Design a protein around this nucleic acid. Structure first.
Ligand SMILES: [Mg+2]
Ligand SMILES: [Mg+2]
Ligand SMILES: [Mg+2]
Ligand SMILES: [Mg+2]
Ligand SMILES: [Mg+2]
Ligand SMILES: [Mg+2]
Ligand SMILES: [Mg+2]
Ligand SMILES: [Mg+2]
Ligand SMILES: [Mg+2]
Ligand SMILES: [Mg+2]
Ligand SMILES: [Mg+2]
Ligand SMILES: [Mg+2]
Ligand SMILES: [Mg+2]
Ligand SMILES: [Mg+2]
Ligand SMILES: [Mg+2]
Ligand SMILES: [Mg+2]
Ligand SMILES: [Mg+2]
Ligand SMILES: [Mg+2]
Ligand SMILES: [Mg+2]
Ligand SMILES: [Mg+2]
Ligand SMILES: [Mg+2]
Ligand SMILES: [Mg+2]
Ligand SMILES: [Mg+2]
Ligand SMILES: [Mg+2]
Ligand SMILES: [Mg+2]
Ligand SMILES: [Mg+2]
Ligand SMILES: [Mg+2]
Ligand SMILES: [Mg+2]
Ligand SMILES: [Mg+2]
Ligand SMILES: [Mg+2]
Ligand SMILES: [Mg+2]
Ligand SMILES: [Mg+2]
Ligand SMILES: [Mg+2]
Ligand SMILES: [Mg+2]
Ligand SMILES: [Mg+2]
Ligand SMILES: [Mg+2]
Ligand SMILES: [Mg+2]
Ligand SMILES: [Mg+2]
Ligand SMILES: [Mg+2]
Ligand SMILES: [Mg+2]
Ligand SMILES: [Mg+2]
Ligand SMILES: [Mg+2]
Ligand SMILES: [Mg+2]
Ligand SMILES: [Mg+2]
Ligand SMILES: [Mg+2]
Ligand SMILES: [Mg+2]
Ligand SMILES: [Mg+2]
Ligand SMILES: [Mg+2]
Ligand SMILES: [Mg+2]
Ligand SMILES: [Mg+2]
Ligand SMILES: [Mg+2]
Ligand SMILES: [Mg+2]
Ligand SMILES: [Mg+2]
Ligand SMILES: [Mg+2]
Ligand SMILES: [Mg+2]
Ligand SMILES: [Mg+2]
Ligand SMILES: [Mg+2]
Ligand SMILES: [Mg+2]
Ligand SMILES: [Mg+2]
Ligand SMILES: [Mg+2]
Ligand SMILES: [Mg+2]
Ligand SMILES: [Mg+2]
Ligand SMILES: [Mg+2]
Ligand SMILES: [Mg+2]
Ligand SMILES: [Mg+2]
Ligand SMILES: [Mg+2]
Ligand SMILES: [Mg+2]
Ligand SMILES: [Mg+2]
Ligand SMILES: [Mg+2]
Ligand SMILES: [Mg+2]
Ligand SMILES: [Mg+2]
Ligand SMILES: [Mg+2]
Ligand SMILES: [Mg+2]
Ligand SMILES: [Mg+2]
Ligand SMILES: [Mg+2]
Ligand SMILES: [Mg+2]
Ligand SMILES: [Mg+2]
Ligand SMILES: [Mg+2]
Ligand SMILES: [Mg+2]
Ligand SMILES: [Mg+2]
Ligand SMILES: [Mg+2]
Ligand SMILES: [Mg+2]
Ligand SMILES: [Mg+2]
Ligand SMILES: [Mg+2]
Ligand SMILES: [Mg+2]
Ligand SMILES: [Mg+2]
Ligand SMILES: [Mg+2]
Ligand SMILES: [Mg+2]
Ligand SMILES: [Mg+2]
Ligand SMILES: [Mg+2]
Ligand SMILES: [Mg+2]
Ligand SMILES: [Mg+2]
Ligand SMILES: [Mg+2]
Ligand SMILES: [Mg+2]
Ligand SMILES: [Mg+2]
Ligand SMILES: [Mg+2]
Ligand SMILES: [Mg+2]
Ligand SMILES: [Mg+2]
Ligand SMILES: [Mg+2]
Ligand SMILES: [Mg+2]
Ligand SMILES: [Mg+2]
Ligand SMILES: [Mg+2]
Ligand SMILES: [Mg+2]
Ligand SMILES: [Mg+2]
Ligand SMILES: [Mg+2]
Ligand SMILES: [Mg+2]
Ligand SMILES: [Mg+2]
Ligand SMILES: [Mg+2]
Ligand SMILES: [Mg+2]
Ligand SMILES: [Mg+2]
Ligand SMILES: [Mg+2]
Ligand SMILES: [Mg+2]
Ligand SMILES: [Mg+2]
Ligand SMILES: [Mg+2]
Ligand SMILES: [Mg+2]
Ligand SMILES: [Mg+2]
Ligand SMILES: [Mg+2]
Ligand SMILES: [Mg+2]
Ligand SMILES: [Mg+2]
Ligand SMILES: [Mg+2]
Ligand SMILES: [Mg+2]
Ligand SMILES: [Mg+2]
Ligand SMILES: [Mg+2]
Ligand SMILES: [Mg+2]
Ligand SMILES: [Mg+2]
Ligand SMILES: [Mg+2]
Ligand SMILES: [Mg+2]
Ligand SMILES: [Mg+2]
Ligand SMILES: [Mg+2]
Ligand SMILES: [Mg+2]
Ligand SMILES: [Mg+2]
Ligand SMILES: [Mg+2]
Ligand SMILES: [Mg+2]
Ligand SMILES: [Mg+2]
Ligand SMILES: [Mg+2]
Ligand SMILES: [Mg+2]
Ligand SMILES: [Mg+2]
Ligand SMILES: [Mg+2]
Ligand SMILES: [Mg+2]
Ligand SMILES: [Mg+2]
Ligand SMILES: [Mg+2]
Ligand SMILES: [Mg+2]
Ligand SMILES: [Mg+2]
Ligand SMILES: [Mg+2]
Ligand SMILES: [Mg+2]
Ligand SMILES: [Mg+2]
Ligand SMILES: [Mg+2]
Ligand SMILES: [Mg+2]
Ligand SMILES: [Mg+2]
Ligand SMILES: [Mg+2]
Ligand SMILES: [Mg+2]
Ligand SMILES: [Mg+2]
Ligand SMILES: [Mg+2]
Ligand SMILES: [Mg+2]
Ligand SMILES: [Mg+2]
Ligand SMILES: [Mg+2]
Ligand SMILES: [Mg+2]
Ligand SMILES: [Mg+2]
Ligand SMILES: [Mg+2]
Ligand SMILES: [Mg+2]
Ligand SMILES: [Mg+2]
Ligand SMILES: [Mg+2]
Ligand SMILES: [Mg+2]
Ligand SMILES: [Mg+2]
Ligand SMILES: [Mg+2]
Ligand SMILES: [Mg+2]
Ligand SMILES: [Mg+2]
Ligand SMILES: [Mg+2]
Ligand SMILES: [Mg+2]
Ligand SMILES: [Mg+2]
Ligand SMILES: [Mg+2]
Ligand SMILES: [Mg+2]
Ligand SMILES: [Mg+2]
Ligand SMILES: [Mg+2]
Ligand SMILES: [Mg+2]
Ligand SMILES: [Mg+2]
Ligand SMILES: [Mg+2]
Ligand SMILES: [Mg+2]
Ligand SMILES: [Mg+2]
Ligand SMILES: [Mg+2]
Ligand SMILES: [Mg+2]
Ligand SMILES: [Mg+2]
Ligand SMILES: [Mg+2]
Ligand SMILES: [Mg+2]
Ligand SMILES: [Mg+2]
Ligand SMILES: [Mg+2]
Ligand SMILES: [Mg+2]
Ligand SMILES: [Mg+2]
Ligand SMILES: [Mg+2]
Ligand SMILES: [Mg+2]
Ligand SMILES: [Mg+2]
Ligand SMILES: [Mg+2]
Ligand SMILES: [Mg+2]
Ligand SMILES: [Mg+2]
Ligand SMILES: [Mg+2]
Ligand SMILES: [Mg+2]
Ligand SMILES: [Mg+2]
Ligand SMILES: [Mg+2]
Ligand SMILES: [Mg+2]
Ligand SMILES: [Mg+2]
Ligand SMILES: [Mg+2]
Ligand SMILES: [Mg+2]
Ligand SMILES: [Mg+2]
Ligand SMILES: [Mg+2]
Ligand SMILES: [Mg+2]
Ligand SMILES: [Mg+2]
Ligand SMILES: [Mg+2]
Ligand SMILES: [Mg+2]
Ligand SMILES: [Mg+2]
Ligand SMILES: [Mg+2]
Ligand SMILES: [Mg+2]
Ligand SMILES: [Mg+2]
Ligand SMILES: [Mg+2]
Ligand SMILES: [Mg+2]
Ligand SMILES: [Mg+2]
Ligand SMILES: [Mg+2]
Ligand SMILES: [Mg+2]
Ligand SMILES: [Mg+2]
Ligand SMILES: [Mg+2]
Ligand SMILES: [Mg+2]
Ligand SMILES: [Mg+2]
Ligand SMILES: [Mg+2]
Ligand SMILES: [Mg+2]
Ligand SMILES: [Mg+2]
Ligand SMILES: [Mg+2]
Ligand SMILES: [Mg+2]
Ligand SMILES: [Mg+2]
Ligand SMILES: [Mg+2]
Ligand SMILES: [Mg+2]
Ligand SMILES: [Mg+2]
Ligand SMILES: [Mg+2]
Ligand SMILES: [Mg+2]
Lengths: 189, 110, 84, 141
RNA sequence: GUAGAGCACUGAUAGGGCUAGGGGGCCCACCAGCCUACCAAACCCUGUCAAACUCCGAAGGGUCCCAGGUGGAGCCUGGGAGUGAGGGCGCGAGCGAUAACGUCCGCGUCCGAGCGCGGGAACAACCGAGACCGCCAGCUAAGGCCCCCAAGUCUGGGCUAAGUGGUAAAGGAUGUGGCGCCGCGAAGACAGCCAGGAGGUUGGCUUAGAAGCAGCCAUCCUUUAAAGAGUGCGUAAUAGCUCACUGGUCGAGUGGCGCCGCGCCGAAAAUGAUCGGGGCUCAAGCCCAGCGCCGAAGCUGCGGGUCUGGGGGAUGACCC
RNA sequence: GGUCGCCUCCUAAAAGGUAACGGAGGCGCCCAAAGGUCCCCUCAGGCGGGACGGAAAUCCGCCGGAGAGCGCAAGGGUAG
RNA sequence: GCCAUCGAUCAACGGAUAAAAGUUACCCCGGGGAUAACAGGCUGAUCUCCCCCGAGCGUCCACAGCGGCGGGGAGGUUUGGCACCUCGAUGUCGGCUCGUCGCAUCCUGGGGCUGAAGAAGGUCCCAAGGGUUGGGCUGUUCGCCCAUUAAAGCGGCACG
RNA sequence: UCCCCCGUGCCCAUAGCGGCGUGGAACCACCCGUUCCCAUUCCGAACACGGAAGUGAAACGCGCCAGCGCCGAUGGUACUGGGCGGGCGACCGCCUGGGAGAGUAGGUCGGUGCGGGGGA
């Protein structure tokens, strides 16, 4: 739940060049600092797949620095569906907003009834200090029948963690399945 | 959001400001009345007369007349003679009127 | 042979172009009377030495130099600074 | 059959199809999606056709998402008539799709099940397509 | 106020939440409790769409001032016109069918009038280039350098095996080279070899037995180095008989997924064929790098003509 | 067959202008107040409360920048 | 005359007269390939042919024979679109005569699968060498019908 | 020449909504009264006049806090003036200059001019 990844500085070098040279341009900022950076693409990839916005990534800077960062945002090539830039948000002692992976557990009554659990939110935005960033946030989705749902206003919350959205943000629900016989009255429509 | 107070103010003030003359503005508190003369080009008061500053008293209307008269004295001295009357949110009547009437025979051209 | 039951067109017209717009710009020298802006409504407002005609036309009242101004919520204004 | 309930205007100019997709480029609902590789006017017939194909494939089960909608009126002048004398009539609606646009999504159906179903769907579409899995990249968007 | 983008307005919009009302059942009705895998206004979240939507908004474009700019520039007055069928190409739109050597506009260009010159086989408008005249001199452009046909059968480095090159799509494939990621592995794997691979199936059943193998009927339990109420063959049927499977043996690599380069199929026409032809396969094809050279009426050299300007003339004639 | 003049919007490619038997709509009137001026006032809509009285008549309260109104089509403008 | 003002669906709205509809195959002249009908050409919507998908049918079994909803092409026979050659003339259907070429093959030849027992048939592949009848009806092309046949192919050639 | 208040402009929400607190010496406001001037399609609500018993409750001024609203980089990308290349073709790609919108970090409970009154 704490990852490393080597980073490097950059100035004039054109992003285009850097990309077709297998690196990935980025940036590194918080209220106090802001620095153009780049990482190895293939190296970022393997890390980011696991870490995501959810877990802290530590940037090994050339000047021997080791910075705690969250990935704040990631810019995609629309055509290619492939990363073209990264934002690294350097953590400070301060509390920070962030997305924490929800973990639904227990197979819902509705899923058994033949429905399907639509996982509306997969992470939830939260105020929390770095030293105490949680991860798996369990959710009993088991009592959920078809036509029911639960909201943010129904979450575990480890201590020292703020429901940083509307409480009424609907978290997940259970929806009736696709069904071939529905096509009948869809034809009768 | 706006009070009818404010709406009147803008409405009568803007019209006068367009004529480009000097502006005789007026404030009419429950206890006093004040009148300053303004160059809206530069945004500056050229001369001012008031009840509080005059250390004056003796029935509001009769008082008001004098502050006008006094206003003209200091005005004409400076060179001011041509002027336009900002009657503010107040109906041209009574106290405000008296200020005008005084400032008139006091020498101001308006 | 060819020319079969075709159709018609229930519309297909327009009005004449009205040549609206700003006619003199910031920094342009102008004679009193010069048309400064042709417009519909006050897309611009008359400022210093600028009058407005019945169809919202903005013209100079003095010989001078045209000057523009955006006063935010109070609208945009065309002025004419006279020249000494 | 998709089409607007109501319409501000009945006929609509054709337009070009410049650039990559404007947005709707990341998976947002299910686990797998179908992505447009080349641009096209996707007919309301095709949308529906793909939809049915998936439905049918995993008979009763899973949920299908449809991230495209035909709001563009498609015109056609009658057969064997000449140019001019007005614009043709509306004869259907299309959805303008561009490369990168995820068009369908599925969920709550096994990985193998999703793969075949989305695959069949693409066969109905007039363009080249690719299937994709929900990524860390998608959830980041 | 466009391209882009955006949803704040006007509309559109999929899912979810929330929630007036509407519908089905219940209570049963008189009013009220209804609860609702149905329909759904407003509203909220996710996710989008629009020439006649815009909270936003470039690049550009326009005009003004200052500066450069002496040009077959510019401005004023007047004499003489011709033109008022245009077209192709690039780009931006409408119409059309995201047809047309289509049509209608806009910006540019060329043909028109440059059907004069080089290239593109041939070819107004594509690439190169604006032809005053002469030369058996030179340099270059595009395009080329194996022969027709001027110049490298030049030099490195890859790919292609289809004559692809030498003109087509969805989509199909153990083509081929190159990158990856994923399990397997000598804690002897993959390929075959291989002793083994009894059912108390007394299948719940079956009827001229329809006792594992028409009969998609819990779809048993055993001895374990491993043997399924069965992956199969003679059957409506007993025999027979493969597979699963562990077991050694073998000894060193094997399996699956993804991306890139180049190629294969899909690929049927009417007088005789063909990449212009011959012909071409570590190329005479494709891609990367380098050094040469060929070549147009362009540019240069030499001679001459004429127009304009500026000098000369310390004058016309003439001269530079 | 349709059209023929005028106006509004788009097409129109961010100055002006710009075509098609391209996409949508209007006009051939009107007002002695719907004109001039001085003075005063501020909408629509929502929620709550209120005899007859309702979705909506008139009254009270709180909210509200303009989504109302501006004779007429549309645009622009507009409660300073 | 001057000044003010009135009479215009002069609406074909820059308004030809104060005052005006048809017809010609009985027709004529000047022009136009600036412009239609024939044919060519570009296009290929329509037309014909061939594919991709595999929903489902075929007792059983997606693929013997079939192929929902949809998707991609080839051809240039049909009807069109466009108006590029031709209006100082490119004669237009069917028949006859003479053919010749294409092959997406009607027959004959060689094959694969078959829900191929055999005989037959179905479907696909190869193959253009040769062959592909005579009548009734209608101007007919097309089409129906009679009698046969190994078969009574379809297209191009200015619908030769 | 620092502080508070009053009138008035300018910048036009970083200034606003909302919340909590503070202020009556002075100013200002509500306040007191309807004789007079003036006034209400009814009402001294408003406008107006004569006042000063009361109060900062309202309003207003000044603070404080970031729920709302508003502002919002850097980095990257879209698009693009100009110049090019690949592909039969649909469309892609390169150099050069310019460069958004969204979103991220983050900012904000205003800043200033002229006059008047009152302070230390
Ligand atoms: Mg390390
Ligand atoms: Mg800071
Ligand atoms: Mg690497
Ligand atoms: Mg550390
Ligand atoms: Mg369960
Ligand atoms: Mg629901
Ligand atoms: Mg239906
Ligand atoms: Mg329906
Ligand atoms: Mg407001
Ligand atoms: Mg008012
Ligand atoms: Mg007002
Ligand atoms: Mg000022
Ligand atoms: Mg006294
Ligand atoms: Mg007197
Ligand atoms: Mg005087
Ligand atoms: Mg015809
Ligand atoms: Mg007709
Ligand atoms: Mg009609
Ligand atoms: Mg117009
Ligand atoms: Mg005009
Ligand atoms: Mg026009
Ligand atoms: Mg005026
Ligand atoms: Mg005007
Ligand atoms: Mg300025
Ligand atoms: Mg300003
Ligand atoms: Mg404003
Ligand atoms: Mg204003
Ligand atoms: Mg305004
Ligand atoms: Mg609908
Ligand atoms: Mg396009
Ligand atoms: Mg784009
Ligand atoms: Mg693009
Ligand atoms: Mg691009
Ligand atoms: Mg898009
Ligand atoms: Mg799930
Ligand atoms: Mg499933
Ligand atoms: Mg497809
Ligand atoms: Mg994926
Ligand atoms: Mg993944
Ligand atoms: Mg998220
Ligand atoms: Mg705008
Ligand atoms: Mg505009
Ligand atoms: Mg708005
Ligand atoms: Mg609007
Ligand atoms: Mg709306
Ligand atoms: Mg809506
Ligand atoms: Mg919805
Ligand atoms: Mg809903
Ligand atoms: Mg009901
Ligand atoms: Mg009932
Ligand atoms: Mg009842
Ligand atoms: Mg009862
Ligand atoms: Mg009831
Ligand atoms: Mg009753
Ligand atoms: Mg009853
Ligand atoms: Mg209930
Ligand atoms: Mg527009
Ligand atoms: Mg637009
Ligand atoms: Mg902005
Ligand atoms: Mg803004
Ligand atoms: Mg702007
Ligand atoms: Mg800018
Ligand atoms: Mg600009
Ligand atoms: Mg100059
Ligand atoms: Mg002439
Ligand atoms: Mg002329
Ligand atoms: Mg003419
Ligand atoms: Mg012409
Ligand atoms: Mg031209
Ligand atoms: Mg041209
Ligand atoms: Mg061409
Ligand atoms: Mg072209
Ligand atoms: Mg298009
Ligand atoms: Mg198309
Ligand atoms: Mg096209
Ligand atoms: Mg074409
Ligand atoms: Mg087409
Ligand atoms: Mg074209
Ligand atoms: Mg075109
Ligand atoms: Mg041009
Ligand atoms: Mg030439
Ligand atoms: Mg030329
Ligand atoms: Mg010629
Ligand atoms: Mg040439
Ligand atoms: Mg040539
Ligand atoms: Mg050629
Ligand atoms: Mg020629
Ligand atoms: Mg040509
Ligand atoms: Mg030639
Ligand atoms: Mg030529
Ligand atoms: Mg060339
Ligand atoms: Mg070139
Ligand atoms: Mg040279
Ligand atoms: Mg040379
Ligand atoms: Mg060149
Ligand atoms: Mg060269
Ligand atoms: Mg050669
Ligand atoms: Mg030669
Ligand atoms: Mg040679
Ligand atoms: Mg071959
Ligand atoms: Mg070849
Ligand atoms: Mg070649
Ligand atoms: Mg080619
Ligand atoms: Mg070819
Ligand atoms: Mg080729
Ligand atoms: Mg291909
Ligand atoms: Mg393959
Ligand atoms: Mg494969
Ligand atoms: Mg493979
Ligand atoms: Mg390959
Ligand atoms: Mg690895
Ligand atoms: Mg691993
Ligand atoms: Mg494996
Ligand atoms: Mg591994
Ligand atoms: Mg071991
Ligand atoms: Mg068996
Ligand atoms: Mg059976
Ligand atoms: Mg059991
Ligand atoms: Mg036996
Ligand atoms: Mg046996
Ligand atoms: Mg993979
Ligand atoms: Mg790769
Ligand atoms: Mg890859
Ligand atoms: Mg091929
Ligand atoms: Mg050759
Ligand atoms: Mg050659
Ligand atoms: Mg050859
Ligand atoms: Mg020459
Ligand atoms: Mg020469
Ligand atoms: Mg000579
Ligand atoms: Mg010479
Ligand atoms: Mg000289
Ligand atoms: Mg001389
Ligand atoms: Mg008529
Ligand atoms: Mg323009
Ligand atoms: Mg009336
Ligand atoms: Mg009044
Ligand atoms: Mg009033
Ligand atoms: Mg109301
Ligand atoms: Mg009410
Ligand atoms: Mg009521
Ligand atoms: Mg009643
Ligand atoms: Mg009321
Ligand atoms: Mg509105
Ligand atoms: Mg109303
Ligand atoms: Mg307004
Ligand atoms: Mg309005
Ligand atoms: Mg305002
Ligand atoms: Mg006279
Ligand atoms: Mg008429
Ligand atoms: Mg009439
Ligand atoms: Mg006429
Ligand atoms: Mg006449
Ligand atoms: Mg005449
Ligand atoms: Mg006769
Ligand atoms: Mg005759
Ligand atoms: Mg003829
Ligand atoms: Mg011909
Ligand atoms: Mg066509
Ligand atoms: Mg048809
Ligand atoms: Mg085919
Ligand atoms: Mg069946
Ligand atoms: Mg079978
Ligand atoms: Mg099946
Ligand atoms: Mg098949
Ligand atoms: Mg059907
Ligand atoms: Mg088709
Ligand atoms: Mg053809
Ligand atoms: Mg033909
Ligand atoms: Mg044709
Ligand atoms: Mg033409
Ligand atoms: Mg032509
Ligand atoms: Mg004849
Ligand atoms: Mg005969
Ligand atoms: Mg014949
Ligand atoms: Mg045959
Ligand atoms: Mg045969
Ligand atoms: Mg056979
Ligand atoms: Mg048989
Ligand atoms: Mg078949
Ligand atoms: Mg033959
Ligand atoms: Mg033959
Ligand atoms: Mg034959
Ligand atoms: Mg016969
Ligand atoms: Mg006959
Ligand atoms: Mg006959
Ligand atoms: Mg017939
Ligand atoms: Mg016959
Ligand atoms: Mg027979
Ligand atoms: Mg016969
Ligand atoms: Mg023939
Ligand atoms: Mg023909
Ligand atoms: Mg014929
Ligand atoms: Mg023909
Ligand atoms: Mg024939
Ligand atoms: Mg101080
Ligand atoms: Mg201030
Ligand atoms: Mg400021
Ligand atoms: Mg504000
Ligand atoms: Mg609050
Ligand atoms: Mg608070
Ligand atoms: Mg408190
Ligand atoms: Mg406090
Ligand atoms: Mg306190
Ligand atoms: Mg006191
Ligand atoms: Mg008294
Ligand atoms: Mg009395
Ligand atoms: Mg009285
Ligand atoms: Mg009065
Ligand atoms: Mg009275
Ligand atoms: Mg009354
Ligand atoms: Mg009255
Ligand atoms: Mg307060
Ligand atoms: Mg707070
Ligand atoms: Mg905030
Ligand atoms: Mg703003
Ligand atoms: Mg930036
Ligand atoms: Mg940049
Ligand atoms: Mg560019
Ligand atoms: Mg460009
Ligand atoms: Mg190009
Ligand atoms: Mg090319
Ligand atoms: Mg490309
Ligand atoms: Mg380049
Ligand atoms: Mg370049
Ligand atoms: Mg740049
Ligand atoms: Mg650039
Ligand atoms: Mg703060
Ligand atoms: Mg604030
Ligand atoms: Mg505040
Ligand atoms: Mg402060
Ligand atoms: Mg200062």
């Amino acid at each position: 739940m704490e990852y490393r990844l080597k980073a490097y500085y950059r100035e004039g070098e054109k992003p285009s060049a850097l990309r077709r040279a297998g690196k990935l341009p980025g940036v590194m900022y918080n209220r106090h600092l802001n620095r153009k950076v780049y990482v190895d693409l293939v190296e970022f990839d393997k890390v980011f797949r696991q870490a995501s916005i959810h877990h802290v990534i530590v940037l090994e800077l050339p000047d021997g620095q080791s910075l705690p960062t969250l990935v704040r945002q990631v810019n995609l090539d629309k055509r290619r569906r492939r990363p073209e830039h990264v934002d690294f948000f350097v953590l400070s002692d301060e509390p920070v907003e962030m997305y924490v992976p929800l973990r639904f557990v227990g197979t819902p009554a509705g899923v058994r009834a033949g429905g399907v659990l639509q996982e509306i939110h997969r992470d939830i935005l939260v105020k929390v200090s770095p030293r105490n960033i949680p991860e798996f946030i369990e959710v009993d989705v088991s009592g959920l029948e078809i036509g029911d749902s639960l909201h943010a206003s129904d979450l575990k919350l480890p201590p020292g963690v703020e429901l940083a959205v509307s409480p009424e943000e609907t978290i997940a629900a259970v929806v009736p399945p696709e069904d071939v016989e529905k096509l009948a009255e869809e034809a009768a429509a | 959001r706006l009070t009818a107070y404010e709406r009147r103010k803008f409405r009568v003030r803007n019209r006068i400001k367009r004529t480009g003359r000097l502006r005789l503005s007026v404030f009419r508190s429950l206890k006093h009345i004040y009148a300053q003369i303004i160059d809206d080009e530069k945004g500056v008061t050229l001369v001012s007369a008031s009840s509080l500053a005059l250390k004056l008293k003796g029935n509001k209307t009769e008082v008001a007349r004098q502050v006008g008269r006094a206003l003209a004295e200091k005005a004409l001295a400076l060179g001011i003679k041509q002027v336009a009357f900002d009657r503010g949110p107040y109906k041209y009547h009574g106290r405000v009127k008296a200020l005008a009437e005084g400032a008139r025979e006091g020498g101001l051209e308006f | 042979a060819h020319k079969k039951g075709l159709g018609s067109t229930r519309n297909g017209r327009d009005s004449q172009a009205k040549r609206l717009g700003v006619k003199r710009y910031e920094g342009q020298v102008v004679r009193a009377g010069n048309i400064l802006v042709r417009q519909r409504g006050t897309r611009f407002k008359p400022g210093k030495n600028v009058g407005m005609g019945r169809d919202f036309t903005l013209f100079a009242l003095v010989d001078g130099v045209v000057e523009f101004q955006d006063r935010g919520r109070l609208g945009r204004y065309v002025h004419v600074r006279p020249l000494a | 059959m998709l089409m607007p309930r109501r319409m501000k205007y009945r006929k609509q100019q054709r337009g070009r199809l410049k650039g990559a997709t404007k947005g709707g480029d990341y998976v947002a609902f299910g686990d797998f999606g179908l992505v447009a590789l080349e641009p096209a006017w996707i007919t309301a017939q095709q949308i529906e056709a793909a939809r049915v194909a998936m439905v049918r494939h995993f008979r009763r089960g899973g949920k299908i998402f449809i991230r495209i909608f035909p709001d563009k009126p498609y015109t056609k002048k009658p057969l064997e008539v000449r140019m001019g004398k007005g614009k043709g009539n509306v004869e259907g609606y299309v959805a303008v799709v561009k490369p990168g646009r995820v068009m369908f999504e599925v969920a709550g159906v096994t990985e193998e099940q999703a793969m075949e179903a989305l695959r069949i769907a693409g066969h109905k579409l007039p363009i080249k397509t690719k299937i994709v899995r929900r990524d860390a990249y998608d959830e980041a968007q």
